[PDB]
Design a protein around this ligand. Sequence first.
Ligand code: MG
Ligand code: ZN
Ligand code: ZN
Ligand code: ZN
Lengths: 143, 48, 103, 35, 184, 97, 1265
Amino acid sequence: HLTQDKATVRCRGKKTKLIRQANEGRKRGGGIKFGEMERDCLIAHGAANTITEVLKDSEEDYQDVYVCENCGDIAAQIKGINTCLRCSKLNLSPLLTKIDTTHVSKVFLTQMNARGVKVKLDFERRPPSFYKPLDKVDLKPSF
Amino acid sequence: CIFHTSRYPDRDSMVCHRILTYGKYFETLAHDELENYIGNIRNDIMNN
Amino acid sequence: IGNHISALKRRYTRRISLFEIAGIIAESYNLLQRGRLPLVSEFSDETMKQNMLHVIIQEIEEGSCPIVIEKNGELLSVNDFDKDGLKFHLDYIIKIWKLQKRY
Amino acid sequence: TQSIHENKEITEILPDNNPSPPESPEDRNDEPPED
Amino acid sequence: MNQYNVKYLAKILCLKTEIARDPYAVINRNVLLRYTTDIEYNDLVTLITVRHKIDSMKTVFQVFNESSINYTPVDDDYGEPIIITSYLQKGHNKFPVNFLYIDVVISDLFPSFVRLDTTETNIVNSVLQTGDGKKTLRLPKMLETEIVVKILYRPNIPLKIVRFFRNNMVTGVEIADRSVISVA
Amino acid sequence: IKNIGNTKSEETKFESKNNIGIEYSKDSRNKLSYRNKPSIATNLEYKTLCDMIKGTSGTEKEFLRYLLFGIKCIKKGVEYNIDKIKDVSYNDYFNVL
Amino acid sequence: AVISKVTYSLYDQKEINATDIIISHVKNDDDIGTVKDGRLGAMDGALCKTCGKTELECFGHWGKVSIYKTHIVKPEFISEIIRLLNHICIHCGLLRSREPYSDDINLKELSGHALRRLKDKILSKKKSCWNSECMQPYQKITFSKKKVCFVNKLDDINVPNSLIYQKLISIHEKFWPLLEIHQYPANLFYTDYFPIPPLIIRPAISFWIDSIPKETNELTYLLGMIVKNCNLNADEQVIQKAVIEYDDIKIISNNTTSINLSYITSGKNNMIRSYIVARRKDQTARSVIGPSTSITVNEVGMPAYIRNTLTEKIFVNAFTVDKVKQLLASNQVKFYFNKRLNQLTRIRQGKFIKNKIHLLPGDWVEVAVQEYTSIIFGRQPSLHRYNVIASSIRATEGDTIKISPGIANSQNADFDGDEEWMILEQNPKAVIEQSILMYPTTLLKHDIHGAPVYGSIQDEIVAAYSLFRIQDLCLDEVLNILGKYGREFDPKGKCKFSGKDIYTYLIGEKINYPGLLKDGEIIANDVDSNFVVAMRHLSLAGLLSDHKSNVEGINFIIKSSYVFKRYLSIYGFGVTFKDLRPNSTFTNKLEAINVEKIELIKEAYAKYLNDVRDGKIVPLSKALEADYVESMLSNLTNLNIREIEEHMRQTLIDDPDNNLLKMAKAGYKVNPTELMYILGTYGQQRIDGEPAETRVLGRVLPYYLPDSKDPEGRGYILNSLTKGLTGSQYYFSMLVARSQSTDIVCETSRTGTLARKIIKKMEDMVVDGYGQVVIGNTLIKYAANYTKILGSVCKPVDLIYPDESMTWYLEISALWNKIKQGFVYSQKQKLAKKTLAPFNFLVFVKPTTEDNAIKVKDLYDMIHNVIDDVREKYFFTVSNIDFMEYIFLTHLNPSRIRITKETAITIFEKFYEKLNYTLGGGTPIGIISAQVLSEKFTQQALSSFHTTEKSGAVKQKLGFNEFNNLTNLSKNKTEIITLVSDDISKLQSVKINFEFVCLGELNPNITLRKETDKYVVDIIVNRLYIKRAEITELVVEYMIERFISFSVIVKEWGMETFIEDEDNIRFTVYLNFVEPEELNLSKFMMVLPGAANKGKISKFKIPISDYTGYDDFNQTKKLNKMTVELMNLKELGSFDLENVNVYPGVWNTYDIFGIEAAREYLCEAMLNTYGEGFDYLYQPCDLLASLLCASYEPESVNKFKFGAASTLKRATFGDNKALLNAALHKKSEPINDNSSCHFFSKVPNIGTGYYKYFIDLGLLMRMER
Ligand SMILES: [Mg+2]
Ligand SMILES: [Zn+2]
Ligand SMILES: [Zn+2]
Ligand SMILES: [Zn+2]
């Protein structure tokens, strides 16, 4: 058992085609797997932003993706215009909204659709809020 | 064995097993392949 | 009797822990790193030669931190929390930051 | 060893030996029916 | 009904007497120290007399099997028959045989509980609000057919919350609350 | 002793000369629905049986049969109280060390 | 822009048809009209014919194929169709009742009980059609599963899908609630078209070799196979089978290797739990670890080969632009990112683009990773929080990752080949969170029991022990020991120094703590492991942290470790062979002792056996004989232990500097048992609590004669390790060793499954903004840790019982009477010794001389008023905190100690600080508790901590298996019922009527003979066997008579009893059997010994024991106890159990006493499974139990029955059918769970994510340029 037969490191490299995540294999420059027990530990620390960034796709791979609020399909872009083919064929004008999710989520949802399950997403439109001055509070004891 | 089970050789005991060495693998494979060969010849002759 | 309990709970809302101050600092720091304008007094070209964490702490201390947090149905600025608790947590944070060569 | 606050003692549970990390992979009717 | 389970039921029909005297009293084993009981057994109707030591006031309970009920009030009657049933049923005066295989009241597992008054109920409801509008938390649930609910019954006081004094190994006693949900 | 039964409801390890009968006794199909009374005369030197054999079907029956056993023991000339019989102590064998 | 809700349902037929892409051919010139045509999406080196974009920007488009008048069933919902065919008449299509078809009842204003009762009646009708329209019997249709079609059970007749479709679509809407229908029956079929999914979910399959042509995807092949049988205009069976094998082949077959749509949710290898809650990452590394004395617990050493590959990010803004320009000029930048174009560029050395680099705010550059940057690293498996931490980078030599030995225990790490992994995350929010929340100094004190998690190890311990004892040192030697920390040492006026002086200097604080410290000086006799090792209850660093803060504790750990290692450098340490065995005197003596004693034992056993072999004594039972032999052998082992202890004492007297005995004294790995193994004897080897069993000729090995009674032949080893074991002894030793290893593997398998289930169940339980414990929308507990203070800050303290010598005796006694109920527990045989103080006030206490002290009345008023104020303002008048007042009144009692006013003010100011600053909303208390419990039972399982034992009475076992049974909550199993009383007759009645006895156990002497017209059977029994069984002769007579009377093979019978002599009883039976005669005779003689019995069959006896129980701290009683296994308590209903305390199992206690009693039982039993000294686990268990009993009935950890768990939470848990059922019921759900947040890339509602953040632009817009 020799040290230099076990050492590994990855900066950037190839991705798997279906899910677009780092590939596997020491001889092929693969990346280490961040398992769900490590995820448990990060949640136990209370570091919500950190785990969110670890599980997301890389910030350098972002792109604009639109979803139809009526049927849940990913909207196509024809001649530079975002359009829902299914709903347009039915003579409807639904709202198209931008989402920022992983590629694997889209694959999973599309496969569920292929099995006949329709998944529809709603969005939050909370009314605007305003800040108000508050009276001072001390909280110290009387000594 | 019905009335005194613990005094009868167990199924995991080495008393009731024998062991295959290098040559026995080849012997068994030769047996099986020869039988398949003769069977195929018989079936072909019957079909013809 | 309900109003008395409500007043007690509103007072209880003002105590501060590590999670809240860490979240406030994280939001402010992300915005500053990505290029917002600092809101410190005496702003000048000499402000851009300082350490960003120093700027964040100064903004918090002088009452110009722009972050607002929603805790128990209310919207609080960093200065609406109990003052002594804020000092307590900031002292600890500054110590460990100095150990890390950040501050 | 001495006893001071024995009623509040904490007992250590830690294996001494652990498994080494993993490495990359790199009919003649001649059998009993086995009912 | 038999000659043994009536002795177990006599202890439940002392907590019920206490609740009749004071609907906000704390109920547990120690209450039994303030009462005495007399039992007269019979295959058709059993008579249980409960007596308060300091006051010397009497209460008389008549116990019948479910099959044959022949009830006529007597002097100092509780005002309602006590019925032993084959299976669990709704009703504060109906007890299944399942509850009476053992001496239930004196077991270490018997709870300690009380009914909240209006002020305490208001305080509890106020504590449960989340402070964001009118949203609120919910207490854990318990069924209406538990023996605790049967013991805490009054005709003109609906029961919605029950407070429990749990045994706690590190603090001695701990306070918890449950909400009562109906059974169809 | 009152009628406490068993049905085919943790694992046991009996000597297997008793296990056959033990497992035979768990089947309700091997028992008559009603008791089969004795028919071969015995104990001709006693009339207490007539008292026990009929009518007495409670604690009195148990008392009478204990009396009969005690009478037999007295006639034979034995202690008749198992509690007053001395059990051999084996600590004399295993007290070494 | 914020996803807030998700709804599931089924597609309508019109929605399926809404597409202009029609697929018709299985082959074509350019795949046009085929299942592989380019209109459905882009592919390898081909733009999408629909949107004209590459693969990276096209997510695919839908198509359809035509089916000619063939109704197709959706496979997943086949069973659903069956459920809908048992509520209507097939022939006439009407419901199986007539009540719904009544205008007198309107269903709109009724729901729940009414609808359920009506549905029950409709289902229970089940009779020939009531109506006269058809007047036909009701059939029973089911899916064949071999032929792809529905068939009738009564007659094997295929039912076409068209008939079922027509019958189902006829049900009116208003009757859907009765049948539990939500959308449309027609949504369960395809009629005119079948969907064709995009190409995104089925790209061409490639291989690791580029030359090898890409193989067709399985999904595409199955779709082509479907299309093959569509245009052919074939029957429904062919298309149905094709669709089923395309969707879920397991519906008909039983092979679980084919790839289809359901593959994503097959088993443990789901897509969710392999790629959504886990994934591989870019900036990562892994390597072998080693120690380093130049790295502190706050740091980690990174090798060069990793520093030269990983890169860190610098964002472009006004503060950093000049530095970025300089770095670009110096050829140090490795990557550049243009945020406005979302474009990444790699700056190759000798080749790159200059004009393309226009730096604007929001962009970033990437350079080589620098020192003091934080990085996340850990060691697997990650059992608890401390296995994954963020530390500062330091550059080191070699190719190994270097850690301080101070963190080794918290990670369960050593240096015999272990590896550790690293990841680098550079988002600014993540950077801040790493710098504060995951920093080792912040993690110093354990979450549950509060002891430090970092400390010294191994030889350091001995060094500490020695340092405290060195006596005559000059100043130069002291300073040589102190090293770089000697600058501030103050030689007040002395010329000679001791180790105590060094320790006082290291503890630079004047604090008191009963036992350890007085005015900052150690007053214990010695320093040992409990003072300096991690996770120990007397840690000095722990006291220093309690006094001020974690910074002081970490500083003490670093400094003390440094000085201990300097002591090792100066003086050295090492154990030699002469320390263990200077000569052969002692070992020879002990060997002779063993040789003599074993022979004595054998002679005694032989004497007993010889007496039994003759007619001098009745033999013992096998169990009793084994017990006697075991007692003799155990006595011999204890004699060896005593000899070893005497030898240790004598050697310490003669050779005070023995290093092995130093290890023993310091408390590291050496004790009398281990020395007995080395120098004394090995003793008895046991498997499952017993010696090895005999197998062929009544023996284990052929080295012993058949039916041998030699104890050495069954695993008692006489030799020691210095002597060397013989071959046969080695056999038994290796038997034990190999069994341990195999059990370790199996337990490793099981514990992980249980741990994952518990973690998933407790994951969403947090502390809210008012200090309460809640999950979802349910209140679990009013006060988070009973105190609303951080768990690691609270401190266990002595419980001082009331005494008449105390100052405020009446008030203290009143409080005790109020709170005492819980301090007597465990069936009244345990009295509590500890309570929980809020913050360890003891380090702030200092005595004073009775005239500078605060007056008694003032101190009492201060305590009372503080408690009242805190009761109203922090616990809202709901919780009971009498225990805090009791602790303060007893530990500060003036009859016990006097203090000044300043001391009291300091104590209570600290109290308020702890109440105000420590516990914050969003604390993930549930997952922390789950991890602590799981880590504990895993480590106990893998170290063989629990040893099996043999018992004669029913007992509750310890270890992992019992905990798993408790969490499973299985029904319909026997439970252990305990009965306790003070009158023994009541228990004796139950014992006599329930304990199992059979004739065969009494060793009878059954003989049979035949006489004219009768068979005579004689049964001779010795009275001593009757006495040992604890029955009477009449009990035996009754057993025999009851068996004979009800026998179905006996025709005529009679019985009599005779007294053979003073010690024998003869039962005579006269018999005549039914025909056939001799066969029944043999059967009777075969079954007689076991069939004549009484009691409840079981493998345990029912002994009655005595113990001493508590009524209060000063009242005791003697109680009798027994235990029995029962399904329920019905049998006890006629046994006069008045004043008898009964403890049943979980389901019986729930049925009788209620849900709160069940919760209490579960908490106590779960705690008991762990063993003796683990009381600190009470709080976590209490939470788990509270979760299992949150509803009105107990709920297992394997299921989600009462909780309103979301669909994605269930799917992550491993349901595999949650999505289908949710679609069937049209469920609409919010997105709040951790699993749901992970699925959609949202921030979990945990820790920093528990709050919502806004930016107030008011001040920015009030500034003018
Ligand atoms: Mg290792
Ligand atoms: Zn649409
Ligand atoms: Zn496209
Ligand atoms: Zn019909």
